[PDB]
Design a protein around this ligand. Structure first.
Ligand SMILES: NC(=O)c1ccc[n+]([C@@H]2O[C@H](COP(=O)([O-])OP(=O)(O)OC[C@H]3O[C@@H](n4cnc5c(N)ncnc54)[C@H](OP(=O)(O)O)[C@@H]3O)[C@@H](O)[C@H]2O)c1
Length: 244
């Protein structure tokens, strides 16, 4: 009968896991590498590996609550669920949209973000986690500010960088203090959507700073279950029921 796989990595995901556990769903949470469900860690081994997992574990439903920029995991979930007739929905918020006072430009990927930075040395907040920071070594004249969940193993791949180690979630006061104190001139961010990571954008607006926003990657179509209640509804509409 019902056995959920929740692909995590965000706050939508952690909150969702808590709700599922409260309601009594048989569910496993998964991270690539804050909630009480039994958690698997690490990749599945491509689409075939995920197919094998779904089949061996008798998964009935997948909820993809991965970050919107975890596009390989999302695309693999589409393919694997399609190959096994397992129901899938994505728990994702809509992208952020600009308002008055926002100074935003958009680029399609991380490479284009690097290319978008000015020639003259700037002070750039790379608000994009740990992945692919190296890419910015192709614009080595800038000062970079990083914010990382864990202390970096080795030396930063960036000629001039400072890493602040923190998780948050972050407040507008906090982010405005950071940007101000590091005299940031530009912010690079991914268009994640949601309230949880939006502080840095309000802070930027407050300080009158430009943001280079990386647009969401393309992922194949699947059902979208964009609030906790939407997820509960979709679960019931696909015959998922809790313990007992
Ligand atoms: N700071 C931001 O707001 C922001 C924006 C964009 C990206 N980033 C970071 O850069 C990231 C790209 O992330 P990513 O490497 O996690 O995504 P990914 O490129 O989609 O994942 C790469 C592989 O890791 C495994 N994987 C990912 N999520 C998993 C999960 N929940 N459970 C099991 N395996 C998982 C899968 O390997 P297998 O094929 O072997 O299953 C997947 O194909 C974004 O997720 C984000 O967190 C951050």
């Amino acid at each position: 009968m019902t056995r959920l796989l929740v692909l995590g990595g965000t706050t939508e995901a952690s909150r969702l896991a808590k709700t599922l556990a409260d309601q009594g769903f048989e569910a496993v949470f998964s991270y690539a590498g804050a909630q009480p469900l039994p958690t698997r860690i690490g990749g599945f081994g491509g689409v075939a590996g995920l197919v094998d997992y779904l089949t061996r574990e008798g998964v009935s439903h997948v909820i993809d609550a991965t970050h919107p920029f975890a596009a390989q995991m999302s695309a693999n979930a589409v393919a694997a669920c399609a190959q096994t007739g397992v129901a899938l929905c994505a728990f994702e918020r809509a992208p952020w949209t600009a308002q008055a006072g926002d100074r935003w430009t958009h680029v399609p990927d991380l490479a284009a973000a690097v290319a978008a930075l000015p020639q003259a040395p700037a002070r750039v907040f790379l608000a994009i986690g740990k992945q692919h920071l190296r890419d910015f070594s192709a614009a080595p004249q800038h000062h970079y500010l990083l914010r990382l969940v864990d202390p970096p193993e080795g030396p930063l791949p960036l000629p001039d960088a400072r890493a602040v180690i923190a998780r948050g979630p972050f407040t507008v006061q906090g982010d405005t203090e950071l940007l101000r104190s590091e005299t940031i001139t530009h912010v690079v961010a991914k268009n994640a959507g949601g309230a949880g990571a939006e502080a840095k954008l309000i802070a930027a607006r407050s300080l009158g700073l430009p943001v280079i926003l990386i647009d969401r990657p393309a992922v194949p179509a699947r059902d979208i279950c964009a609030t906790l209640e939407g997820v509960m509804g979709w679960l019931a509409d696909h015959g998922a029921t809790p313990r007992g």
